């Protein structure tokens, strides 16, 4: 039956990149499993040890792989007891595995190892290992396993509350090439995130945008749903409203409602509505950590309030602004607006004794400097997109040789004939 594929997957045991292909179908090789089918590996094979292991649960280059099949078997079987214990025995063996090809195989392994895990002994005792061989493999120069492991420990720091440790972690990190775009986006995701929590937004949008690009599609939804959640947040904090065509894309539109209820709060610049909404959806926003990002917006909302009150009025008595923004005192106002001015938002001045804001003009109509930068930046993008496509596109290249000898001879003959004539 289906175990043939497991044997066919073993036909990928020849050498090198076969494993890659071997893994691909093996991704879906876990569709069918039986405990008796487990005995298949018992018949497939050290051998005695393997058999013993199989019994407990319920060539080497494929030994690690069949251990993968054991993990997959257990984890997917819900049973954590044997699954958990097995990992400790399987993870160790495969880990210390004095093989280079095995590192690639173990990544799928580590990907599960952390996963099922719960706490300290897993966050802490299991983390010390991931960093250990992380260094080992780092010297072993296996790109894939490295990147994966790095991602796992990052995800650990963020299951924890420690952004700094992960940040300075990045500071000493160099990431490698040859990757899997999914892992690549896992990285860019975590990166963008911690990069954001530290307040620096404008570089977070970058890494998360890449997390959108480099991510695959098929059905990899929840990652997109989640990220976007962070995407919308960053776009919002940075002060740039996202377009509706965002809150309505796919099945995720049912989870983005909170953020779709934030922008309606933010764009309007009405604080009370905002706050009320935060109370409304708070619990919903806590299931991820986007919350404490969102609670920062109280600044941005008010910025918006001020900027709108400015564009729509040439001069306003402080009284009225304080009424539109619901705030307690005028004295509060001119602190807020005095602040807005310094930030290059309003371009006004304030008449204090009469207490009304009076507002700057668009003499800055055709700045010319603005559009230029935007234009310049764009051009570099088109170029790169044209350079990368010329360096990649540039790769059935063979079977070359015009001219000829047979024909040449014929030509010569013809010439000779002509001469004779």
């Amino acid at each position: 039956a289906a175990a043939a594929e497991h044997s066919q997957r073993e036909l990928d045991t020849v050498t090198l990149e076969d494993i890659k292909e071997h893994v691909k179908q093996l991704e879906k090789a876990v569709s069918g499993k039986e405990p008796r089918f487990v005995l298949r590996a018992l018949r497939m094979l050290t051998s005695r040890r393997l058999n013993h292991y199989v019994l407990y649960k319920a060539l080497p280059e494929v030994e690690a792989y069949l251990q993968l099949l054991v993990v997959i078997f257990m984890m997917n079987s819900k049973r954590y007891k044997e699954a958990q214990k097995i990992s400790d025995d399987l993870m160790q063996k495969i880990s210390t595995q004095n093989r280079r090809a095995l590192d690639l195989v173990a990544a799928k392994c580590y990907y599960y190892h952390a996963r099922v895990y719960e706490f300290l002994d897993k966050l802490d005792v299991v983390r010390s290992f991931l960093h250990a061989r992380l260094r080992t493999a780092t010297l072993r120069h296996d790109a894939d396993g490295q990147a994966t492991l790095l991602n796992l420990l990052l995800r650990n720091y963020l299951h924890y509350s420690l952004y700094d440790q992960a940040e300075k972690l990045v500071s000493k990190s160099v990431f490698p090439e040859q990757a899997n775009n999914n892992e690549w986006a896992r990285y860019l995701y975590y990166t963008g995130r911690i990069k954001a929590i530290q307040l620096e937004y404008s570089e977070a949008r970058r890494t998360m945008t890449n997390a959108l690009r480099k991510a695959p599609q098929h059905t990899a939804v929840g990652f997109k749903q989640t990220v976007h959640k962070l995407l919308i947040v960053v776009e919002l904090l940075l002060g740039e409203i996202p377009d509706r065509l965002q809150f309505r894309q796919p099945s995720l539109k049912r989870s983005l409602m909170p953020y779709f209820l934030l922008t309606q709060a933010v764009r309007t610049g009405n604080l009370a509505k905002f706050n009320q909404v935060l109370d409304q959806f708070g619990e919903k926003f806590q299931a991820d950590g986007t919350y404490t990002l969102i609670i920062r917006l109280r600044h941005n909302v008010i910025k918006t309030g001020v900027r709108m009150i400015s564009l729509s009025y040439s001069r306003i008595s402080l009284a009225d602004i304080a009424q539109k923004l619901q705030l307690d005192s005028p004295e509060d106002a001119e602190f807020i607006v005095a602040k807005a001015i310094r930030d290059g938002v309003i371009e006004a001045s304030i008449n204090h004794e009469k207490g009304y804001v009076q507002s700057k003009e668009m003499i800055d109509i055709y700045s010319t400097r603005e559009p230029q930068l935007a234009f310049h930046q764009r051009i570099s993008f088109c170029l790169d997109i044209h350079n990368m496509s010329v360096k990649a596109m540039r790769f059935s290249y063979n079977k070359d040789l015009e001219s000829a000898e047979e024909r040449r001879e014929r030509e010569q003959q013809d010439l000779e004939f002509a001469k004779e004539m």
Partner: protein, 376 residues
């Protein structure tokens, strides 16, 4: 046909409710009976959520089985006595019958295979017209864009200007079915000269649409030129008493009233389908225009002048302009301290710049997106 009206009334029943349980619903059902329809009855019941009389459904399906049986049989007799141009016709009655039975896929396939025949033009073209017709009926989109391209070719080759006009009526109505009113302007506005395609709706309805969209997306001197001075409208625009009253109110600087008729017609759009939720886009815009048109002759004017004109309170008026100013959709700016409003003219560049960048970004996002795909 299939008669659109079924669909329009269906949408009517959907409405914000409104229930009712009035003319509409029983109008529909009444045209289920005489139409022995089915694919609705489950489709509609599952949508509206109000099924009953499992017997009626069975009767309708039965008679349907009878006639589909019959047409199938007729076709069988042709296969032995073809009758090329004939066979295709019995098919046209087949898929057509799927239209009376309002089943999409079926008439679809039926028609298609009839194209492999068809051969002529009215069959290979007009049949397509009906195929898309279904599109209009279901509230689809692409299903049409791909067929209006087909007919487009069939007309570009030869044909005449009689089919091209219906065609522009369909394309136009479609354009209205989206936010694309500009394209519908010229299309529909030019559809007044000829309109044999009563298939969809009557003439005065159409009239109200072409006048609506015209008022919306035409310039002031070309409004006066192509609509206010519409030989085909004067006789019709006298037949009505709503849109026209608004159209005139604008053109002639009689604002304050313009508003009332505007609200009226708005309350008449949410009822239609071609607009559905566009009733919110239309009025928004029709607010701006007037505000725009009112200022254009002033470098400064006082609120109370405006509010007085339109006949609303200041505070509400200010509150309205505040919507349009920050978006640079209106070249005003306000001074509330003195209750005054001055107008800052815009620069051509400022317009395109904002538009160019927006467009460029849309193309960039699409370029990159699919870039990565083809890259991997």
């Amino acid at each position: 046909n299939p008669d659109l009206r079924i669909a329009q009334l269906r949408f009517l029943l959907s409405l914000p409710e409104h229930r009712g349980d009035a003319a509409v619903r029983d109008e529909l059902m009444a045209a289920v009976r005489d139409n022995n329809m089915a694919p609705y009855y489950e489709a509609l019941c599952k949508s509206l959520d109000w099924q009953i009389d499992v017997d009626l459904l069975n009767k309708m399906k039965k008679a349907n089985e009878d006639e589909l049986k019959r047409l199938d049989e007729e076709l069988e007799d042709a296969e032995k006595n073809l009758g090329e141009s004939e066979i295709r016709d019995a098919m046209m009655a087949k898929a057509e019958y799927l239209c009376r039975i309002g089943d999409k896929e079926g008439a679809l396939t039926a028609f298609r295979k009839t194209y492999d025949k068809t051969v002529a033009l009215g069959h290979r073209l007009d049949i397509v017209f009906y195929l898309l017709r279904i599109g209009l009926f279901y509230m689809d989109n692409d299903l049409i864009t791909r067929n209006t391209e087909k007919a487009k070719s069939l007309i570009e080759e030869g044909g005449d200007w009689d089919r091209r006009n219906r065609l522009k009526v369909y394309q136009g109505l479609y354009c209205v079915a989206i936010r694309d009113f500009k394209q519908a302007a010229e299309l529909f506005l030019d559809t007044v000269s000829t309109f044999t395609s009563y298939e969809l709706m009557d003439y005065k309805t159409f009239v109200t649409y072409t006048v609506y969209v015209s008022m919306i997306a035409l310039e002031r001197p070309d409004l006066r030129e192509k609509v206010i001075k519409g030989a085909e409208i004067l006789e019709v625009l006298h037949s009505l008493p709503a849109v026209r009253q608004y159209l005139f109110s604008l053109y002639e600087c009689r604002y304050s009233v313009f508003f009332q008729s505007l609200a009226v017609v708005e309350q008449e759009m949410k009822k239609d389908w071609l607009f559905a939720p566009h009733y919110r886009y239309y009025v928004r815009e029709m607010r701006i225009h007037a505000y725009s048109q009112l200022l254009e002759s002033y470098r400064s004017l006082t609120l109370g002048y405006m509010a007085e004109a339109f006949g609303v309170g200041v505070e509400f008026i200010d509150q309205e302009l505040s919507r349009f100013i920050a978006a640079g959709r209106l070249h005003c700016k306000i001074d509330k301290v003195n209750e005054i409003v001055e107008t800052n003219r815009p620069d051509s560049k400022n317009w395109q710049y904002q538009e160019t960048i927006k467009k460029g970004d849309l193309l960039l996002n699409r370029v990159q997106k699919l870039s990565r795909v083809i890259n991997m």
